[PDB]
Amino acid sequence: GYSFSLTTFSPSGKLVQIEYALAAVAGGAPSVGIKAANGVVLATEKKQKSILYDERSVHKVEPITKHIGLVYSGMGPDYRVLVHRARKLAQQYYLVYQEPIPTAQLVQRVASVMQEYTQSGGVRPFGVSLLICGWNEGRPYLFQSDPSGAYFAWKATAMGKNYVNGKTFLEKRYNEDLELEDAIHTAILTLKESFEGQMTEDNIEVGICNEAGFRRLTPTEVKDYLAA
Amino acid sequence: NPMVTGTSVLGVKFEGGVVIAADMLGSYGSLARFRNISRIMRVNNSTMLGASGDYADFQYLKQVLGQMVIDEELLGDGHSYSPRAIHSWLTRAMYSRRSKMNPLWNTMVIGGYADGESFLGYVDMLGVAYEAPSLATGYGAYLAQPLLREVLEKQPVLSQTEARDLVERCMRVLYYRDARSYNRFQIATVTEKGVEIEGPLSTETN
Amino acid sequence: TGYDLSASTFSPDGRVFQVEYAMKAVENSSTAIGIRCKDGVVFGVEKLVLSKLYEEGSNKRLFNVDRHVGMAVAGLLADARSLADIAREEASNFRSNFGYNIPLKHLADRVAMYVHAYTLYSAVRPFGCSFMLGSYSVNDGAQLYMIDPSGVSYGYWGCAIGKARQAAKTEIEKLQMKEMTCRDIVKEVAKIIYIVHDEVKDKAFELELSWVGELTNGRHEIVPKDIREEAEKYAKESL
Amino acid sequence: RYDSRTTIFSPEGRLYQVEYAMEAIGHAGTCLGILANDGVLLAAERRNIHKLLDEVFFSEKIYKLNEDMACSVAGITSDANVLTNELRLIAQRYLLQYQEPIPCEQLVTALCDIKQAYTQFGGKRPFGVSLLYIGWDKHYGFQLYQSDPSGNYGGWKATCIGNNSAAAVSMLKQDYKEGEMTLKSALALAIKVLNKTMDVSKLSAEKVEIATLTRENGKTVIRVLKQKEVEQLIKKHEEEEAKAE
Amino acid sequence: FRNQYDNDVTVWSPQGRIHQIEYAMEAVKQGSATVGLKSKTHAVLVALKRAQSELAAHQKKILHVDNHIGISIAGLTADARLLCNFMRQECLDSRFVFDRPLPVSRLVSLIGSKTQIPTQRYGRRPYGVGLLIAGYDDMGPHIFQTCPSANYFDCRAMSIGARSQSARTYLERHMSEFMECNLNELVKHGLRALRETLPAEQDLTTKNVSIGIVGKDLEFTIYDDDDVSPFLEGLEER
Amino acid sequence: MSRGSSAGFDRHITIFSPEGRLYQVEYAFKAINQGGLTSVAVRGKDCAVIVTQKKVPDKLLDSSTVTHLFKITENIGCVMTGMTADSRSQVQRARYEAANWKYKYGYEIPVDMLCKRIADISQVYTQNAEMRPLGCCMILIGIDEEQGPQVYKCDPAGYYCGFKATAAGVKQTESTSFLEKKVKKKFDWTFEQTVETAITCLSTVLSIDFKPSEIEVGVVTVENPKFRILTEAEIDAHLVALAER
Amino acid sequence: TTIMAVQFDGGVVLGADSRTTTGSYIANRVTDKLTPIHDRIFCCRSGSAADTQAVADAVTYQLGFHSIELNEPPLVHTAASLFKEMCYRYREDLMAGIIIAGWDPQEGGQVYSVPMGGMMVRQSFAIGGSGSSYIYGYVDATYREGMTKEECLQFTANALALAMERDGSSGGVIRLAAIAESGVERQVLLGDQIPKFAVA
Amino acid sequence: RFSPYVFNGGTILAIAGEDFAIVASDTRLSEGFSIHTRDSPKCYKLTDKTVIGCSGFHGDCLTLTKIIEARLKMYKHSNNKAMTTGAIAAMLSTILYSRRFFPYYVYNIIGGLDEEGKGAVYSFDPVGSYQRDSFKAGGSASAMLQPLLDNQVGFKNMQNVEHVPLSLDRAMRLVKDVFISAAERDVYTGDALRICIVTKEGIREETVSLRKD
Amino acid sequence: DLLRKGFSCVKNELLPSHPLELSEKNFQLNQDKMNFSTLRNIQGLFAPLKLQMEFKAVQQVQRLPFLSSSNLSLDVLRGNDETIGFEDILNDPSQSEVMGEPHLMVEYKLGLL
């Protein structure tokens, strides 16, 4: 009962369909984002386990502009649609104002787009929650977008499956003093705490964002990092 | 505004059917650019058609008017577009095209023989449609219509041979006294048997 | 059960039931066979005379969709007639845009995708009929294609759709249709129709023929009558 | 007859979809506003108590709609974002027409019209957001306004929406110096109200979002209270209840 | 065991069957008997007006459509009057464009298409009226009957409406001698066909029979009450 | 309006399960298995090959016109598995999109971009209320210029990914296991350690040796980058090459 | 602008100049006016450059899509009809005169001559563009039937040289293309290779 | 660059007596300086009691006469009676005005019997200002015809003359003579004279000859 | 014959403001017709029917007209998810800058008025 409509508030007044997209995200593939003092790292967990699968084709830590990148945990196709329209929004803003889009504004616009499916009838909310990194005039930014359209600003957070224990792991492992080179390492540790399969070369995808802009780490650099 | 035009179409009734003719040329202004085009259609087994004016619009009509004939013959009920029906449909099409200030720059001469009674209709770019035993378009209306009407007022009913010869004489007159004309014309004749187009026919004059 | 109220619904085992009822709907209509031979394709239907009050020629099932293309249907007469009308528009559009006649293999793909396009929406329902397109042209010989309500389009040497497609297919398999002419194929078609027909339930039918091919200059036509009587007879002494 | 379609009257008159919309409000953070003679404050409970959060920037439930008037939200926060955007746009539109800042009732009614349009012709979820408005205008001075997902609204001298709303309003009714209170006397009253509507957790500046509005020198001032002022207000109320023993 | 499938027209029964269409047939069985036999030269439509109200003039079964096409309705009055307007529009447009009477056998196909369109879309109902079309064109008389199933038939004689099976049996027993009949005998045969539907206790009075004839030289003329005395008189007892 | 969202967790497309899993999408996956056909695609470093069954359960049917290898553009070809009508419709969509890409961007569409476009289109079906996922999965192949030989696969969920060698159909998981053992073992696959690999996979997973009438092979090579369907003879040649030892 | 095409036995030979004037100034003097619609089908563009270029691109789009759908090389008449439609619906907004010519398996070498306006007519030889007026007489006097590929090329080169020496909107290098069953054999006649006729 | 209009010429004339309503017109179809045909009558029969006669641009004449016939059939279908003369005139005014910004270049005169059987004639303009008159003439030669009709029918400017009611025979004589006179001076009028006599017994047509030049 | 809405007339206007008034304002429908004619002619009637059939049910439920809308699924159904033009940056519907009463704008969408 009442778990059928997406436009029917429960007698308890809580939207059960968005309640379910949260479960879809929680049943996804883990992702971790960390704000270091001079940059942001996004790392994600790859389900392309079989050797036949390729890395040269599909990517998860996928860029928006010279200085904003995403990572998700949920349904891949819904991601791809969301990243396509985030690119639209960034370019729209850049045409209107000759200015790289602020991270917060891109987050707000994407969150509005995501909410626009939460209250329409005859559609479904996106089955993904986004983690967004950016760098705007000398301070890092990290945001998480809820499928309901809510968005939050996190110093460091974990998402996807087994996230509550990743959230607790980041607790007594994070502070102001950590910086990007150490942030990479602690994010890797956070992932392997629940990796379930003892990572190698490309079991993960990592992205960074300092003033050199958003950059996806090549597998060789990740290999360098897994050495310690 | 037209670019490639045709000069004149002649047509005269006779006892048993209708004979019409039109020369084979398209003028790109004062230039005889295309010298083997045909400006005579066979609509169905009882009605032909000729046209002067823009030739691209005539080809558009060939596309459309041809298509309705197939569209009805597939039905296989047996009713067919009588010559008067094609004339009315064409009149309506060009009146509608005129009312939108995008006229079909043409002046057709529909001729047909159905139900034992001949038929000859005229439609121009402005939807001026009527019927007459003898028709002419362009400077045909000044150089060939007078001879046709002179011959018809004395003898009102013509045989096949006299009508064909009269058309040939009028074509000689047009060839002499019309700038945008060619000495290779087509004659299309309809009888009970069906549409018949002979061509090309020259004009061996003295 | 429960997963069969709309075309936009996959059954738990992965079967769109509301297109499989339609493919099972045509088994309510009488059979229709069409055989392809060296010179052309000839159709033939177990046309039912519902009552003697009907004119000889009501409920035709052998529509002409274009000069060189035929059509024999089976299923709901209304929906099949609507599809015949739709195909009549594809041929016209192709002629208007490209000048020459529409290839049969292309027409069967233009319409099959249309029947399919009604099989994936909750608003509309799938067409409840199957039909055979037949044609001949010196460029490409004779072709025959069949379209089930699901939208699957395949070309056939011998086809049969209706309530007794199985017996008809079994009997068609007994001819060397690749080595025969329409003149000798019409006789076999009438033979098949009477063999497959079940008289006990369906007295008073009207055998209805049509061929298009070399011997008719590639124009679709209902069979000239005297041939229809010779085939009628030939099927009769054999039975 | 029942809970569906947001466009059905139950056989008893009650729009059940809207009654459920005014249920999500009973779970969001407590938000209250108090009207004083010389200003207006708009306090709110910031229930994002998690420590890994950042970006304390000006607001999480206290938005600014134009040069004069500000807003607060409660309920589904995404719909609240949509509504705040619409409010800002409406205020700018009125300013574009008449070249004066919009009177507060004008904007409140303009929004309530949309919120009611969603509890009518539709087929869509009604906005499950209950707002609070604080602002100034030359027509009536300081004003405070409430709204429900139903599209209803009303001017309140002192109110509260969200969690523990009933106890807060009861204390405010029994506790209010109606018509003759200054600003930070009302600030002390608001701290007392929130101290009434705590969870088990004792409140601190990390759990409160007081904001104030002021009529000064011809320009309207909305300064969100910083850390130190809030902690000092908290110690003040703490001593006051201590000696109240 | 088919209650889920017999509510919407866009739902096939799990038997290859649309129940809604078959229920649209059942509207035709709720009208009143009407007969549409034809001869070599003429076509007639004999219909029995509804004696269901009293003291109020009976309904109007036979409808003028054009100078050469007439119709008889045996279904929902709403759908009947909605289809007759479309028929009139088609005939008017045909005379406007081609300046020729619209052939019957093409108007009937247009009806078939227009009545098939609703049979497939959601939120619509099939046109619950069965027609009887009498017409004359270049190929002489025609009698086409239309069903709510968007299926039109070419008929040498047909009856639709309540108890029309009796009339169909009678016509089937007398179809051969219909081609060679003067107008009088044709109308008498049609009147008899309509008569074999009624209960034996009542006879065809002048206030419930609505002969309408079209043919070679006669335009489609509707004969209402007392004017149908010439046709009805001379009709022998059962 | 439309028939309405069928009431149920698995009744409809957009409705979400309690742990957030679309069901009609997965039933669409299990609709691929209808037909019984299975397909295999592998690539060497200079050729990409797709091999599928050609099951004709009748002799009246024109074997020439029954097929599952369609040519999208001159350099891109696909093999469709699943319900036939949806497969052919998606081929139409692929051809249109690939021609449109060349029209708008002036160069042949790379295989990845085509597969991504079609995955995007197919995902949209998994979000509205009467469109239905096409029960058919695509396997594209081709050479772009430098990226290398590529073999991609769509699916009704809208997912797509890169494959060194893939398979689809009923006997798919076992084919995946065999093909994984293939790639683990030795991966030159010039042109011969190719197709013998695909045919060997299809046979060893399916049944005893095929004979040339049941196999449909299309190839693209680096020095011949046009989709060529192998004729009945040369397929038979590779078949004896299996037998010939 | 003196595009030219001739149908020989078994194929077609195109021909065009290379000169794109924007008044009296030569904006581009090595223009390639032989846009390949398909593998063995060509068009020649005359008139406003933008309209012809856009029309050729639209037609190559539609024709490539059609060829893929039919799984066959397209007939030249199909490309001619596709050009006719676009040039006729927008006859007011366009200033294109196209000389569609190519080869197909069915009808052999074909030359269609869609002028400004939307006509579609077949020609044994078709010429167009501004300079064609100065070689109408030459082509009428010299064309014969059954010409081979080589003398067709020589005829085309002569006609184009005659036009370019006279017309100011025509000059530069002569681009030829000999479409046949095997494939196109393009060539450019430049400088000395252009036939020269002794001025008095 | 395209003249959407052309003047084909043609003259019409109507007389309303007591039991009749004459509608007459020449049958010459002209254009510029050419005679398209000599047997194109410009009077059309609408109803057993009403006859319209149009003149001017022939294309609009054809279109208008077909629209009018269609509208009579629609009226007959909806209202179940043939239209009266006044109703047809009012409809025609409305139809003409619907193209106020693209006018029907036609001059129309309705001649027939009203509800009580007395004659009635309605005269129009290219955009539909109609009125009842006892007689009228429109078209190219209207300027030649109207003064003579004013003199002989309306007895204008004559003194001490008995106002005899206009008889049908005298009406025919008058119409034939006025068109004989008009054919002499107007180049657009001649080659025949179709006269429609609308009486209570139907519509009977007489046609005579004019100057053929 | 009324007002309180800007006397909805524009009859004086009629003729376009420019040869680039109606065409540029409705190039969305113009491109729809271009692609449909491309697909009717070559692909079939099924493809334009699909496009109409879908575009219907992407617009039925996006948001009420008096609020801004993004229309996501429509954009990646046409090529517009990676092709952005002058209709996206100039006077975006987000800041529509002119609105009427909500109700009065959501009714006409369906067409009550």
Curated annotation (Swiss-Prot), chain D:
Cellular component terms per the entry's GO annotation: cytoplasm; cytosol; extracellular exosome; intracellular membrane-bounded organelle; nucleoplasm; nucleus; P-body; proteasome complex
SUPFAM superfamilies: N-terminal nucleophile aminohydrolases (Ntn hydrolases)
Keyword annotations from UniProtKB, A to Z: Acetylation, Cytoplasm, Host-virus interaction, Nucleus, Phosphoprotein, Proteasome
Expression triggers: Down-regulated by antioxidants BO-653 and probucol.
PTM annotation (Phosphoserine): residues: S10, S72, S170
Residue positions, PTM N6-acetyllysine: K124, K173
Keyword Ribosomal protein: no
InterPro entries: Ntn_hydrolases_N, Proteasome_alpha, Proteasome_alpha-type, Proteasome_asu_N, Proteasome_bsu_CS, Proteasome_sua/b
Location relative to the cell: Cytoplasm; Nucleus
Biological processes, Gene Ontology terms: proteasome-mediated ubiquitin-dependent protein catabolic process
Complex formation: The 26S proteasome consists of a 20S proteasome core and two 19S regulatory subunits. The 20S proteasome core is a barrel-shaped complex made of 28 subunits that are arranged in four stacked rings. The two outer rings are each formed by seven alpha subunits, and the two inner rings are formed by seven beta subunits. The proteolytic activity is exerted by three beta-subunits PSMB5, PSMB6 and PSMB7. (Microbial infection) Interaction with HTLV-1 TAX protein favors NFKB1 activation.
Family of this protein: Belongs to the peptidase T1A family.
Protein name in the entry: Proteasome subunit alpha type-4
Species whose genome carries this gene: Homo sapiens (Human)
The gene coding this protein: PSMA4
From Swiss-Prot, chain E:
Induction trigger: Induced in breast cancer tissue (at protein level). Up-regulated in liver tumor tissues.
Keyword Glycoprotein: yes
SMART domains: Proteasome_A_N
GO molecular function: lipopolysaccharide binding
Main location: cytoplasm
Alphabetical list of Pfam families matching this protein: Proteasome, Proteasome_A_N
Entries under InterPro entries matching the protein: Ntn_hydrolases_N, Proteasome_alpha, Proteasome_alpha-type, Proteasome_alpha1, Proteasome_asu_N, Proteasome_sua/b
Glycosylation sites: S109
Residue(s) of cross-link: Glycyl lysine isopeptide (Lys-Gly) (interchain with G-Cter in ubiquitin): K114, K207
Localization in the cell: Cytoplasm; Nucleus
Annotated keywords: Acetylation, Cytoplasm, Glycoprotein, Immunity, Isopeptide bond, Nucleus, Phosphoprotein, Proteasome, Ubl conjugation
Domain of life: Eukaryota
Residues recorded as bearing Phosphoserine in the entry: S109, S176
One CC-aspect GO term: nucleus
GO biological process entries: immune system process; negative regulation of inflammatory response to antigenic stimulus; proteasome-mediated ubiquitin-dependent protein catabolic process
Function, in words: Component of the 20S core proteasome complex involved in the proteolytic degradation of most intracellular proteins. This complex plays numerous essential roles within the cell by associating with different regulatory particles. Associated with two 19S regulatory particles, forms the 26S proteasome and thus participates in the ATP-dependent degradation of ubiquitinated proteins.
Family statement drawn from the similarity comment of this UniProt entry: Belongs to the peptidase T1A family.
Name of the featured protein: Proteasome subunit alpha type-1
Organism field: Homo sapiens
The organism's taxonomic lineage, starting at the top: Eukaryota, Metazoa, Chordata, Craniata, Vertebrata
UniProtKB/Swiss-Prot annotation, chain F:
List of residues that carry Phosphoserine: S17, S63, S64
Matching Pfam families: Proteasome (PF00227), Proteasome_A_N (PF10584)
Taxonomic superkingdom: Eukaryota
Cellular location(s): Cytoplasm; Nucleus
GO cellular component, one term: P-body
InterPro entries, per database record: Ntn_hydrolases_N, Proteasome_alpha, Proteasome_alpha-type, Proteasome_asu_N, Proteasome_sua/b, Proteasome_subunit_alpha6
Gene3D superfamilies the UniProt entry points to: Glutamine Phosphoribosylpyrophosphate, subunit 1, domain 1
Alphabetical GO biological process terms: positive regulation of canonical NF-kappaB signal transduction; proteasome-mediated ubiquitin-dependent protein catabolic process; proteolysis involved in protein catabolic process; regulation of inflammatory response
Keyword Acetylation: yes
Modified residues (N6-acetyllysine): K102, K104
SMART domains according to UniProt: Proteasome_A_N
Modification Phosphotyrosine, positions: Y159
UniProt keywords, alphabetically: Acetylation, Cytoplasm, Glycoprotein, Nucleus, Phosphoprotein, Proteasome
Family (UniProt): Belongs to the peptidase T1A family.
Binding partners and assembly: The 26S proteasome consists of a 20S proteasome core and two 19S regulatory subunits. The 20S proteasome core is a barrel-shaped complex made of 28 subunits that are arranged in four stacked rings. The two outer rings are each formed by seven alpha subunits, and the two inner rings are formed by seven beta subunits. The proteolytic activity is exerted by three beta-subunits PSMB5, PSMB6 and PSMB7. Interacts with ALKBH4.
NCBIfam families: PRK03996.1 (NF003075)
Protein name: Proteasome subunit alpha type-6
Organism the protein comes from: Homo sapiens (Human)
UniProtKB/Swiss-Prot annotation, chain G:
A cellular component annotation (GO) from this entry: cytosol
Keyword field: Acetylation, Cytoplasm, Host-virus interaction, Hydrolase, Nucleus, Phosphoprotein, Protease, Proteasome, Threonine protease, Zymogen
Active site residues of this protein: T1 (nucleophile)
Catalytic class of the enzyme: hydrolase
Record localization: Cytoplasm; Nucleus
Source organism, top-level taxon: Eukaryota
Induction remarks: Down-regulated by IFNG/IFN-gamma (at protein level). Up-regulated in anaplastic thyroid cancer cell lines.
Family membership noted in the UniProt record: Belongs to the peptidase T1B family.
Subunit structure comment from the entry: The 26S proteasome consists of a 20S proteasome core and two 19S regulatory subunits. The 20S proteasome core is a barrel-shaped complex made of 28 subunits that are arranged in four stacked rings. The two outer rings are each formed by seven alpha subunits, and the two inner rings are formed by seven beta subunits. The proteolytic activity is exerted by three beta-subunits PSMB5, PSMB6 and PSMB7.
Function: Component of the 20S core proteasome complex involved in the proteolytic degradation of most intracellular proteins. This complex plays numerous essential roles within the cell by associating with different regulatory particles. Associated with two 19S regulatory particles, forms the 26S proteasome and thus participates in the ATP-dependent degradation of ubiquitinated proteins.
Listed name of the protein: Proteasome subunit beta type-6
Primary gene name: PSMB6
